Structures are given as structure tokens and as C-alpha cells.
Amino acid sequence: VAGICCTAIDTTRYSDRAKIVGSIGRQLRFVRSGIADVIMVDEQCIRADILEQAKRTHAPLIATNDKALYGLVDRTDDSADDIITILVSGKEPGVVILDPVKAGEVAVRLVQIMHEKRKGLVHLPTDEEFKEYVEMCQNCDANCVIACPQGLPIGEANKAAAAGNIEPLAELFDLCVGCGRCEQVCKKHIPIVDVIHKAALPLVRAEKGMIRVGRGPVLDTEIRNVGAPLVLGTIPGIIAIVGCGNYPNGTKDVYIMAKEFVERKYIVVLTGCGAMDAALYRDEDGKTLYEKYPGDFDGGCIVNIGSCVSNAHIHDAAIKVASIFARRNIRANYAEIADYILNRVGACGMAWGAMSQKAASIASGVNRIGIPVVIGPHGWKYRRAYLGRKDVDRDWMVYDARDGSKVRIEPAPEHLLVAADTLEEAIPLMARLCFRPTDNSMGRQVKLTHYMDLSMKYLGKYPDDWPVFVRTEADLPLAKKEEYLRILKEDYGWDVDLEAKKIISGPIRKFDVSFDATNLEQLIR
Amino acid sequence: MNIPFDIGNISGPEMGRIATPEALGRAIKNAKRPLLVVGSEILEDGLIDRAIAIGKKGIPIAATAHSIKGFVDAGYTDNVYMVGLHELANNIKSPDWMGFDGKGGYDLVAVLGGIYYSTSQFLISIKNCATDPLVRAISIDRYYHIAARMTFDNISRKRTDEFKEMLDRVVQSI
Amino acid sequence: MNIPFDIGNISGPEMGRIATPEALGRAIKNAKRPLLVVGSEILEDGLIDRAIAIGKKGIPIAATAHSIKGFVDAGYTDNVYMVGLHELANNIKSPDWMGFDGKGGYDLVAVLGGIYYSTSQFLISIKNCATDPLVRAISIDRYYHIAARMTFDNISRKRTDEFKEMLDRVVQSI
Amino acid sequence: MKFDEKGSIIDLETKVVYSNICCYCGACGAFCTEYISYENGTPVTKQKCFEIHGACFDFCPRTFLPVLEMERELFGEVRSDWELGYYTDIVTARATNPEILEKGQNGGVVTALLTHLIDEGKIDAACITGRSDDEPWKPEPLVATTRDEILKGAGSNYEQCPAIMGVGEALANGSENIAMVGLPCHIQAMRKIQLSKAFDVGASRVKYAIGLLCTETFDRDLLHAKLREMKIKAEDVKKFDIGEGKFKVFTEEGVRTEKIATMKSCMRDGCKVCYDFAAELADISVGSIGSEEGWNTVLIRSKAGKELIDEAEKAKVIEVKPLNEASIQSVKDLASRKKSENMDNIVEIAGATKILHLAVKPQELSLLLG
Amino acid sequence: MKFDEKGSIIDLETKVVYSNICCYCGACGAFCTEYISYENGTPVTKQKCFEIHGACFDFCPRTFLPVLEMERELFGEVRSDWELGYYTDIVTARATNPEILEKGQNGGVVTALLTHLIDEGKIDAACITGRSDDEPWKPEPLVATTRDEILKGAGSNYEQCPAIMGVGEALANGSENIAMVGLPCHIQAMRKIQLSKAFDVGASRVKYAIGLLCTETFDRDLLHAKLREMKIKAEDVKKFDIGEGKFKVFTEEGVRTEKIATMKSCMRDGCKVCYDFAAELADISVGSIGSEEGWNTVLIRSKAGKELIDEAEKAKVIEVKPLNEASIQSVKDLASRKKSENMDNIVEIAGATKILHLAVKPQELSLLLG
Ligand SMILES: Cc1cc2nc3c(=O)[nH]c(=O)nc-3n(C[C@H](O)[C@H](O)[C@H](O)COP(=O)(O)OP(=O)(O)OC[C@H]3O[C@@H](n4cnc5c(N)ncnc54)[C@H](O)[C@@H]3O)c2cc1C
Ligand SMILES: Cc1cc2nc3c(=O)[nH]c(=O)nc-3n(C[C@H](O)[C@H](O)[C@H](O)COP(=O)(O)OP(=O)(O)OC[C@H]3O[C@@H](n4cnc5c(N)ncnc54)[C@H](O)[C@@H]3O)c2cc1C
Ligand code: SF4
Ligand code: SF4
Ligand code: SF4
Ligand code: SF4
Ligand code: SF4
Ligand code: SF4
Ligand code: SF4
Ligand code: SF4
Ligand SMILES: [K+]
Ligand SMILES: [K+]
């Protein structure tokens, strides 16, 4: 028993004997593979042509939710015996069963029967068929590539295979998001999706990862352990990799983000397709992230919160930090808690492949409680974003709750909902979006060390405006403190005493450990 | 027939005009404060040499995505600014934004070597929001940018040599 | 620049092609079972004379709206059928529909003298649903019918003289 | 008109402004004061406009110019002479009034005909070109409503004037009968406006289009830089002239000259693709080549043009004489020169020439056609 | 190639099929067996296709044909002779094998060259034309893989064959070295296929394009009506020929002739806009005019064409001798009459010709340029 999309996560949460095939991008390819003897679907993120695809592989379809009936007969009231007879005999390619107990019995009894009847079928192109397909391709200048959301080089890949090199085609399997648009503009009627699959069969069959089951809520003891280091900043932030798989450049990007941040002792949590895709890769010692790191909600740990509905546990963790660690009331007190999270809880979401309407509402609900979100380049297609103007002083004024004075704060977080184009831009951005005005000197120093090192690693240069996050010398990364002090003096014109290793002028604001930052007039004492 | 790289990117009635390389170059030349915007695709096919040649004519470059690395590697970073395409769009449409040198906004924005579907939305933003003062956005890339004011037609990747001849003609016309 | 009568009628990427009057005429000539579709605007500018000239070449007429009144008053009602534009679209895309004479469907549909926004949707129904067997729908009207396969460009009403000159050339070519 | 095209500011910029073939005729700005201004002799807009199609594109002589189609609509005939265009008669002429003959460039024909038209009440405004008293010899449109104002605009200015700006001013100031003077490019724009079926701007009120022969206009900065090389201040230049292969600059102290070839470097870029030497679309075309000193070469084209000269001659405001075949061939020769040289510049910018399915570079039309 | 245009089936129907300028070359059908079929010599589709751009439009010689640009790619040089195109030599030749010589239309040069290529393993398929056994003299593509099949294609068929259908068949059957024979329109399509940068259908495997000289092809219905008027049944016809101002119809009882001008009414409409008499883009072009009975006029064009004639002459499969100047002139005369008369047809269907801003009817081109 294995699943695709979140039902796979929730099912493995019930049984550690089930398995997960993978994310949305893999759905069409797995179904087209014909490995499944029976397909049982419910609702959301299901291929709308799943009846077609099931029929093609001679797998009966069991639909269990009224959101998706596919023209099938509602046999909720029929005996499980009569349903099996109908499906086995083939007079109907699927059925609707809105009674879940009956649906389960039918599926289990039916898969044993179909497993025997489906032996001997072949679903993917053979070697000869594959050869005929790549040879007949006309290497069209602008057909399949134009219909493909990722603009993949299918024609050039086909001709390379016709000339005896299948690597170009095989490379496309992971970049492909299994949408099927390419095939519909091909007059040659090449099953492009299946041709890429055939070329990558070896790697597809070797796709064997390991993922921790959805843990769900964060424990109270974990909130008490990370609360202060998170608010002060010495835990450099919560990195939440979530969302769909409409990635620009394959599924390894989310793995590389999770890996990079866990190695830097961020709290790394994942859900839905993101959590799935990060589990497909193994490091030099052959271990998946979920095998190498603990599942505790703590710095340097990898946590599969669970399915897309489990995202709410991330909100809940930030609320509990305000309630348990800051002793704030939460009962019908949304604004005060959201303002707390925006000013003190270093966190950043990442939906590198954001696609669905559920992904837009997730981002909205995360944004409203004060947590920024980065999305992939396809995210421009949502039309709207929430972007800050770091140059407009009046936009970054917060109140010191001690006396009601107004203080201009560094852009922290600079943006609320922003789309990045490449992994190499996105990772420094995420670190940047974890800065918060209430970071202490050690916490800012931790966060700034990672932001500067990550910027140099992925972009080859320190950010143009990194000094905005420097309030005192103690904020400066320790190993390069003296060089940073010189850079502040000679490249940014700050008044710095290199002899005394002390900054005199330049910072956006003076460091004040007691600065009680809030946006809410009602919190002024 | 003008083919947008994503055939579904038929946004509305005002569609980018096909322009000669010489006309695209003269638009950059006639601009009081032009800006070259490059993306991750500049790191390929020796395209950064053209960006650098444009920059050395006195034109600032917005290096979006992770394109800054290629400039650092190439040894040309003067008047090249690291920025996100997303924030760059919001800043260009903001009349109070004083630009990367603090002297004012940009009247002409030209894109090159950018991921198609994000660059296109960057162009649509300026087309629809940077109206007063008007900011003209053009494309000298290999794609037919229906959302640009002026653009080249689609040039397939297997015909990249043709794209480079046309881009080189843009550079000579600035 | 092709101007759709409703500037907002940018339906998708497959946009109707400007065709000469002779090419539109020959497409009716080459059809095995052409059908002329006229709407309420045929009752103006002596346009029904052109429709009757077409019908008298052996071509059936679908008189939509209340255009049948004009054919009654003109004295030509043979091979002219009263029908609604909506039901007509459903019928043409139905491969089992045997036409007005019961002999089969129509392979070429030409619209003339029709309310723009409803005739356009009539054309888009055929383009998108009459695919196998393929039915070719064209416009010989005064509008740029972006939903037609082939069409004229927009001819404003104050230039109706020019439109009539082209429409007459269509008739000459059938 | 036939072969008309729809277009907006974006098409104007794509095809004319950024193609470097704007000639500064003034037509786009004259009928879009709402958005268009001029900088360095080229139109700009500073705010987005929202017309589906614009007069800027419709009226521009460099977006689409179906010359032979416009010849048939204005003259009832197409040319038989490719060098001078369509004309019924070529004659030399000069004004009879000493004051006009002296202040006029050559023989004062244009000024005489204009003063005649206004004194007979046949026009109430003459859209011509004046001079800035702040910017020396800087040409500016002049809507003349008095025979004095007409004389003020006498003489040649070799810098380009957005003359059509004055036409637009006159068409909005209540003038009911307008006569306009223009170089070939101005005339082209004037005729495009009058023959347009996409826009109505009252252009039927323009009853006379008086064309001037033109080889090229000069860029102001380059021209005045030559005036400094020649040790001449524009404030003291009394007259400009081009003759005997010489560029003449007249001051009280006398006349300083220069080889006309050394001046080609001062020409406007927009003139490089100009294919009209003799103002082929004007009611009449008035020049100096072919005539003697103090006389004007006049080509009669339209019925209105023929009527203007006949009536003027019958009123003794001008004196007309025949011209020999050699003198006519002198005019023809310079036309051919401008058209041959400037076609070479045209085919460098133009896209492929298509004839049904056949497509060729324009300069290779002969290899394909014979 | 340069001046290439993207298009789909709708563009093909708009610009070619419904414009009445399809020449039944067979290219669009050859590379879209999935949708295109032919009815009365024109392509049709019966179900909607979904390609953004199609090979039907790209390969068609009547959508866009940049002949000079194609000449540069194929020969490295454009033409210096308008009537005949680019060529390095014109000779007269005939086959040496008596059986080929008796079966060939004139001297059997084409059959002799194809037989030489297959005998020496230079080709494994010759894409030529044959005759239907059920419909008399109806030409059909012939993919010859034997020297006997090559001989079975000898002789002229004056009805049009969709010959490119054979090239597409050979490219789909595994042939690695292909030669094809074609009328000028077939040659144009083959060259568009080989030079396309929009589609790769493996046409680099076509190694030889042998062109036939052609004045026109005849509509089947009209031609066979003419045969009935001559009281001749098509099944009784042994050979067709056109010579000595006469259309010759050979039967066992003897030869029946008719003045060739009366055959013009039988010509295919698509041939009325054909601007290529001598197969200007072929490797070699083979004809009859200028040569003696039993001999062929052969224009050498490409380097592959030259080496083919030299290697065939060395192998003694053809005999070659120079052609006289008066003979070459007779070839140019027929080319000029075809091109001049059909350009008259071209300009009646062609849209306006545009040269930068200037727009004129193609037929009035010389009034604008002289
Ligand atoms: C730039 C230029 C180039 C010329 N080149 C040639 C040439 O190569 N060969 C040739 O034979 N003749 C040429 N002429 C025409 C010639 O110089 C005389 O203007 C013409 O013969 C009329 O003489 P006139 O005495 O009748 O004019 P006038 O009676 O003096 O009246 C001249 C009229 O021209 C108008 N005018 C002056 N300058 C301009 C301008 N820049 N734009 C528009 N209107 C203007 C004045 O406002 C006035 O109405 C040129 C004229 C100009 C302005
Ligand atoms: C329709 C037509 C018109 C012609 N008009 C002229 C003309 O006006 N002036 C002139 O000098 N020569 C003309 N020719 C060429 C001439 O008739 C001879 O075909 C040519 O000289 C070659 O002679 P051959 O003896 O070498 O041919 P052969 O050795 O007999 O070989 C002839 C080859 O042509 C192919 N072929 C025959 N008919 C067709 C066809 N319809 N389409 C394509 N391939 C075909 C055959 O399959 C064969 O491969 C014409 C040919 C044709 C088919
Ligand atoms: S199925 Fe894959 S290759 Fe095809 S269009 Fe979708 S993403 Fe591109
Ligand atoms: S559309 Fe089909 S034939 Fe064309 S390049 Fe793509 S796979 Fe090949
Ligand atoms: S408002 Fe109209 S005339 Fe004015 S610049 Fe815009 S398109 Fe041109
Ligand atoms: S040529 Fe005249 S109408 Fe055209 S853009 Fe220039 S000033 Fe405007
Ligand atoms: S050369 Fe032509 S474009 Fe230039 S001023 Fe004279 S008429 Fe105008
Ligand atoms: S599938 Fe392509 S080649 Fe075939 S008819 Fe359609 S557009 Fe043309
Ligand atoms: S000319 Fe040839 S390629 Fe073109 S439509 Fe006709 S048969 Fe097809
Ligand atoms: S005249 Fe032209 S189109 Fe006709 S068969 Fe001969 S080469 Fe082809
Ligand atoms: K794409
Ligand atoms: K409307």
C-alpha cells in the first residue's frame, strides 16, 4: 500500500508498513508506469484525467469523495461482492463508493484479484518503441518546449537519444512535473512523458529514499527548550520547507535548502510535497536527511510535521512560544500574538514549488500571523506579492513599548511574500528573512555569520547592504570581525576605530537590550 | 507568428512589438537612465560578455537570481547591483525610488538572460504599474516577450548562434 | 494591428487570420457543404442582397435572430432556415446532426451581418468543439473575428462602403 | 486611404523613432498635445496613453506612405516621371513686388502666392515657418494671418521645423481656409492627414499645400558648429543660400561660403531615408534648381495648384516663363541623385521585400526581377 | 534559413490553399501523414491539429521562398543570370546505354545518372515518379531501390506528381543515401526541407536533387478531355512529348500532334504563379530546349552536381559535348517568357510591396523605383 500526495503522508502516520511513491510531479509518471493494480482516490491534487490513466493501465479506479466522481456510478449502497464482480469483469472502469469502510474492503479484496489479472501487461515503451519515437521526432523549434511549463529541451533530447545518447532525456525525468501538456502539441503523437521515463528507468527504479512519518504537533517541552534561543536569535530561525512541486529545476533544490540550514543548526520543519522531495536524496554516507538528523523540534534537526493540513502546527508552535515562553494571553488575542511573532520569532517559510490554491491560502494564513514566505519563480503567477521598501524610512518604524517612542528598524523581515528565481538566490534570502529587531548581540551574530557566509558561498559576494544588520561590534561574525570593521570603515564610510575595534557611528540604531519592539499602540506602557 | 515561450501567456490586447536589434539598441541609447536587468540564464552561452559590454557603455546592471557570481567570476562588478527580480519590479514602479545610485528612477528597463515566466511577469508588472512616469520595458533576450513593449521573436536554443548575432547588433547600436 | 470589436476579446493564442476576400470566397467554393450564417445586422446597408446572392449560388442560409423577416420581405426564403444562433452552434458541433436538409453536417460556416459579441462566441464554440470532423468557420463580416479561422480586419461603420466592396469580392469569388 | 495601417505610440516608436527615421515633421505632436512632446527633434511620451490606435501613427509619413495611391486620390493620376513625380507643367517664375522679391529666398514666389491668397480673401491663415528671436535662426511654426506676418516668414531656413505643429494650431484656432508651406516630408504628413479615414481633425480646411524642393535639413548643433569654424555668429547671419555647389552665409560684411559637400556631415539622420526631392504630393512645388538667379522653378501638380498660378499671374503678383529641357533635366538630375543615394540608406534598414511567396533583400530586387 | 516564417495549417490555408497558389508538390503531405491528405491536388485536414507551428507551412514553397538566400546556402553565390539562375556550366548530354537511351524522354540523362549512383552505392533510393496501372498516365511517386525500378520511372509525365511524398517515404523507410528528381517546385520544397532550421526530418540523407526544366503541368481532367478531342484513349498512349511548337502524343499507330498554345488552357492554376523555369535551386537541371533530338540540356549548378556529371562521364554512362551560344539563348528565351508572363499573374494576387515606409502595388514597382 503506497500513496501519492498527502494521503500518503497521513496513511504512513497510521501504518509504518505503508510506503510513499512521491509528490504531485511524480503522479502521472507512476500511474503511467502501471505498477498499481487498483487506484483509490479521494480529493485534492488528483490528476483530473485519472480515470483515463487508470483505464489505460487496466487498473480499476475507486473514487471515495463527492468532490471527484468522474462520471462513475455511485455504488455506495451496493454489496462489496457485487462491486468487485463489476470491476473484475470490466463492464465499468471504476466506481464511486462514498462509504469508506466498504471502499476499503473493496480495494483490498480487488487488488489481490487484479494483481493476477494484470500480470503480463506492458505499459512503458519498449526499447524498439523508444527508438522509433526519438527517431521520428522532428526536433520542432517551438512546439513541445513552448507547451512545457519548464521549457524543457525535449526535441534536442530526443535527437541525442536517436544518436545514441539517452542522458539528455534521462535528465529531464526529475525536471519534469508530470503535467502532460507537451504531448498534446506533438503531431507525431510521441508519448513524451513515457519516453523520458523509459530513458530514466534505471534512476527511477533507484529512487529509494527514507522519510520520517508526520509527527504533527510541537511538544511543550520543545517550546521551552528553544523559546529563548529562538527569540534572542542564537537558534538562527525556523525554516519551514513546504508546498507543492512545481519547481523550476527539479526536486533536489528543496533537499539542498533543508541540508544547508540543518547543518547550520536551524530548526528545519517540512510538510506535504516538500517533505517528500527532500527525502529522495542521500549524502556521501548514503543517508537521507531524515536518517541523519533527529526529529526533535530543535536546532539542527529535520522534522516532517506532516501533510499540508499539518502546516497549522507551525503556526501553533509560534503561538506557544508567545504563550509559554513570553506568558502572553492567546484567547481571542490574534493581533498581539501575530505582532509578537513578527517582531521576535525568527522564521521563514519556503514554498519553492508553490502551485495550488491551497498553497496561496497557506501563505496568506502564515503571512497574517507574522511569518514571511519565499516562493519559487512560478509564484509570480499568483499575481500578488507583499514586498517591503527598505529605502523608505517611514515604512520601518516600530514602537518601543517601554515609553511609546518610535524606532526605525533594519528590514527584518524585509519582505512578507516574495518569489525568488534560483536556489542560489533563495538560500541567502531565507537567512536574511530570519533577522528580527529583538535579536540580541549573540543571536544577531549567529544569524549574520550564516547570512554573510551563505551569500559568499552561493552568490560569490557579500550583500551590498549587509551593514544594515550591524548595530554594534558584538553583532559582527567573530572569525572575520577585524576585516568587517575595516570594510565598514573604508567601503561604507562608517566611523570605526580599528585600533579599539569599536564602531563609533554608522549603525541604523543603537543596541538596547531592553528595546520592547511592537507595532501595536495598545501595547505601549 | 510571434510565439510566446509559454503558449498560454496571452495576457491581454497590448502585445509586445517585434523590433530590430538596431531599434532595441537605440532605445537603450536614447534613454536618460537605462537599466540592464539580467537573470540566471546570463551565466550560459557566453552571454555575460554581452552584459559586460553593455555595462561598460555606462549602463548599470541589475544582477538578479544568482547572476552576480558570474560578474564576480568575470571580474566586472563596477556598477553592477545584486537584487531580486521581484523587489526590482516593485522598486522600478515606485516613482519615489531613487535607484541604485540614489539619483532617480530608470526610464528604460531591458531584460536579458532571464527565466522566461518570471521575467515575463516582471515585464507585465512594469507595463501595468509603471505608467506615470512611464517606464519603458524592452527585451533583448531569445524569447518573444509579449509583455515587453518591444522584443525579439522566439529564437530556439538550438539557434543560439543566431540570437548572439542579433544581441551583438544590439550592443553595437548602443 | 488587428482590432477585435471588443478589445477585451483576447480569448487565447490561436487568433483568426486576416484573409483576402478572394481567399474567403474560395473557401466557400471549395467546401462540400458550406453554410452561410446571418444575424440581425444583415437587415441593414442592403447586406441581405449579398446574402441572397450567396444563397442563390446553391448555399443554405441559417437566418439567426429575426433576420428571417428580411428574407420574407425580400422574396427569397428558399434554402433559408429559421434557427437560433445558440442551437445552431450546438447542432454544427454535433457530428450526428444531419443539417437542415437531412443530408449531413456542414464543413464550412461563414458568418455575416451578426451581433459581434454573440457571433464571436458562436465562432469560438465551433473552433473549440467542432474538431472531429473538423468544421472550418470563417467571417466575411465587418469585424475582426479573432475566434474565426479566417476573417477580415475591422472595418468601421463609417467605412461601410469599403466593407461592401470587399464583401462583393467574396461573392464574386464563390 | 488604401494600404492604411492601424498603430499606436508603441508602433511609432518601434518603426520610426527607434528606427532613427523620424524626420521631425511635427505631425504626431500637432494632434496629440495630450501626451506627445518633442526632445532633440523626436517625439516622446512621459505617461502611458490608452488609445487602441493613435493619430501619431496614422499621420506619420514614416510609418506607412502609399505614395502612388495618394497620388491617384490627390491628382487622379499616378506619376509617369519617377524623378519629379506627377506634374502638368514646369515653369520658372518670380514675384512682381520689389519688397517681396527682395525679402524672398530666390524670387519670392511662395510669399507672393500666399499674400495673394490672403488679399483676395481665399485664405485666412498661412501655416509657415518663422525664426526665434531668443534662439538665433531656430525655425518655429508661424500661423500668419496678415500679409506682414507672411513676409516675416520669407527666406529659407536650413534647420528642420515641426511645421505641422502650426497646421494643428491653425485647425484649432478657428481658421476656415488654411494654406500651408512645407518641405516634402511636411507635405507627405499633410496629405496623410487629409486622406486619413481613421481620424477627422478638420483637415479639409487646409485648401493649399505649397511644397518646397529639399535635399536635406541640418542638425542645429552641427550647423552652428560650422558657423563657429567660419567665425560667424548666428545672431549676425542675414540670409542662408545653397548654390554653385556652395553653402552661402550672408552677413552685412558680405558672404562667407563653404563647399556643400563639407556640409553633408551636418545633415539630419531622418533625411537619410528621404525619397522625395520635389515635394511630389504638393499642390505646387517651388524650388531654385533649373531657374536663374532671382527666379523660382515651379512644378504644377493639382488643379488647385494650376488655378493658384494662373490666377496669381492674371493678377500680376508673379511673372511666369517657360523653362528649357536642359533646365528641367537639371531638376531631374538632382532628384535622381537624392533618390538614388537615399534608397541606398533605405535598403540598409528595410526588412525583406516580399512579392507573393518570394522574399528578397530590397537591394537585390534586380537579381530577382531582372 | 534567413527570412523564415512560422506558421500552422491555418496560415497555409490562408496564404496558399485558399489563395489558389498550391502547386501539388506534396511536401506538406509528405511530413504530416498524421493529418494532411490531398483532394484534387490540394491539401486538406479532417481533424483539428494542435501544433503551435507546423512543417506544412515551413516546407511549402509558396508560403515563403527566399530564393537568393537559398542560393547562397546551396551554391555559396547568388545568380548572375536572371533567366537561368546560378550555374557554372551548360552542356548537352545523353545516355550511352541503348536501353536507357530508348526509354528516356530525350537522352535519358536523368535515368543514366540515377543508375550510375545506385550501381556505385552512392544512393540506396531514387525518389522519382511512376504511372498508375489503374488510372492511365496518372503519375505517382516512385521510391526506386533497383536499377530496373529507376528505368520504370523514365519518361516525362505532364500531369503534376506530388513527388515529395516519395522523399518522405524514403526518409521514413531507412534509406541513408537518397537521390530525388523534381520539377522546379519540387526542388524548391526539397531545398526548403534541407535548409529548414525549424524542423529536422533527416533530409541531410537526401544527397542529390536533380531538377527538370518545366514550363507547366496540366490538370488531369482538362488534359484527358483534350485527349478525347484528339480521339485518343490514355491507355493507348505510349509517350508524351512537347517539341517543335507541338504537343506530341505517341501511340502504336503513330504520333498525334497539336499546337502547344492550345494546351495552355489545360495548365494547372498553381503553375500560373511559378517564377522558376530552369529548376534554379537544383544540383543539376536537365531539359530538352537547346539540345538535339535524343539529347539533353544540362545546367551544372552545385559542386555535387558538377562531380556527378564528371564522374558519370568518366564512367562512360553519359556522353557530353558543348552547347552552342544560340542554343543557350533559346533556353534563356523560354525562361524569360515563363518568368515575365507569370510575374504578371503574381502581381495580381500579391499584396502590397513595402520598402521601409513606402508601399506600392507590386505591378507599380518601377513607377516608384524607376
Ligand atoms: C531646408 C531647405 C532645403 C531646400 N533645398 C532645396 C534644394 O535642394 N533645391 C532647390 O531647388 N530648392 C531647395 N529649397 C527651396 C528654396 O530654398 C526656396 O525656399 C524655394 O525655391 C522657394 O523660394 P521663394 O523665394 O519662393 O520662397 P519665399 O518666398 O522666401 O518663402 C519661403 C517659404 O518657406 C518656408 N520655410 C523656410 N524654411 C522652412 C523650413 N525649414 N521648413 C518649412 N518651411 C520653411 C517659409 O516659412 C516661407 O513660407 C530648400 C528649402 C529649404 C527650406
Ligand atoms: C511536366 C514536365 C514539363 C517539362 N517541361 C519542359 C520544358 O518546358 N522544357 C524543357 O526543356 N524540358 C521540360 N521538361 C523536361 C523534359 O521533358 C525531360 O523530362 C528532361 O529533359 C529529362 O530528360 P531525360 O531523357 O534525361 O529524362 P528521363 O531519363 O526519362 O528521366 C525522367 C525523370 O523525370 C521524372 N518525372 C517524370 N515526370 C515527372 C513529373 N511530372 N514530376 C516529377 N518527376 C517527373 C521521372 O520519374 C524520371 O526520373 C519537362 C518535364 C516535365 C515532367
Ligand atoms: S510532462 Fe514534463 S516535459 Fe511534458 S510539458 Fe509537463 S513538465 Fe514539460
Ligand atoms: S512536438 Fe513532438 S516531434 Fe516536435 S520536438 Fe516535440 S517530441 Fe519532437
Ligand atoms: S494618445 Fe494616441 S496619438 Fe497620443 S501618443 Fe498615444 S497612441 Fe499616439
Ligand atoms: S516623422 Fe513626423 S509624425 Fe513621424 S514620428 Fe517623426 S515627428 Fe512624428
Ligand atoms: S530631406 Fe526629406 S526628411 Fe529631410 S527635411 Fe527634406 S523633405 Fe524632410
Ligand atoms: S499537424 Fe502541423 S504539419 Fe500537420 S496540418 Fe497541422 S500544423 Fe500542419
Ligand atoms: S505547394 Fe506543396 S507544400 Fe504547399 S500547400 Fe501545396 S502541396 Fe502543400
Ligand atoms: S510550372 Fe512551376 S508549379 Fe507548375 S509544375 Fe512546373 S515547376 Fe511546378
Ligand atoms: K515553455
Ligand atoms: K465594442
Side-chain angles (χ1 to χ4, degrees), chain A residues 139 141 146 148 151 248 378 380 385 387 389 391 414-415 419 421-422 424-425 457-462 464, chain B residues 4-7 40 65-66 68-69 72 82 84-87 91 94 96-97 117-118 121-122 156 158-159:
Chain A
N139 205 6
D141 239 13
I146 303 308
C148 172
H378 288 286
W380 290 74
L387 300 173
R389 291 270 314 280
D391 58 318
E414 180 176 6
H415 301 303
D421 284 290
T422 62
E424 293 84 348
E425 170 199 358
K457 175 175 177 181
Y458 284 100
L459 308 171
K461 174 196 179 110
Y462 293 141
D464 291 326
Chain B
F5 199 66
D6 279 317
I7 187 60
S40 49
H66 64 296
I68 188 64
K69 196 145 205 205
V72 161
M82 314 151 86
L85 192 72
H86 224 166
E87 53 184 357
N91 294 343
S94 302
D96 66 309
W97 184 56
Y117 44 90
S118 52
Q121 284 294 92
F122 164 92
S156 76
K158 53 191 180 72
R159 301 167 69 169

Side-chain angles (χ1 to χ4, degrees), chain E residues 12 16-17 21-29 36 38 41-43 55-57 59-63 162 189:
Chain E
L12 181 69
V16 175
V17 182
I21 64 170
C22 168
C23 54
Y24 199 33
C25 71
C28 56
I36 286 178
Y38 291 111
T42 52
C56 59
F57 184 89
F59 294 168
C60 180
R62 294 287 161 84
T63 54

